[PDB]
Amino acid sequence: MRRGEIWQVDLDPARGSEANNQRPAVVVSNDRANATATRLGRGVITVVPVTSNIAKVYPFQVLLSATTTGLQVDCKAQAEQIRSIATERLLRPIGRVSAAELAQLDEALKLHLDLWS
Template identity: 35%
Template sequence: MTRGELWWADLGVPRGSGPGLRRTVVVVSSDDFNGSRLSTIIVAVVTSNTRLAPMPGNVLLPPEVSGLDRASVVNVSQLMTIDRRDLEESIGELPAWAIAEIDAGLAGALGLGVRG
């Protein structure tokens, strides 16, 4: 698995407002991290709730870009560290422009490159 790939993942039983069940995720951890012997991977949850698209940092993915059957949104505020075994099926790889937008969204959500 590589950074920017979309996968179906088993996220288990949802707790509170967190995601759960079988969901689409995008791998956001670095390829160095992904290629290590660690058994975990960092992902951002993807949702079909397009009302979340205008939220800060989120990225709208048209179906022709994601390979999914409808427009979807990468929710940069829902990051998860999951076991690699929870990744069930590869969907495809996002184009460079989408990964760049996700990077910008993650930087904003995590305060990377911002002082104060």
């Protein structure tokens, strides 16, 4: 379990326009925290949900090509939907994002979370 891995996760129950249902998501917490998650067997890690709707890819979102990741179809990661989840919610590991996709996700996270300064 390391950063940039894509796992399937259970975001349910959810409310409003939040990411819902069982979705792929990208590990964005640093490998340090994730390592201690693995040591505890329980814990929280932070991930970015993915969505199928590729009609428009917004600046805070990053496009993942199913070729690169082992995803079933081309999807976009939504930094504006970022959220930390208990490791109970990790169902299965789908794949890994490319290093370029990861860099753009870092950059999208700075944009959405205002981490420029």
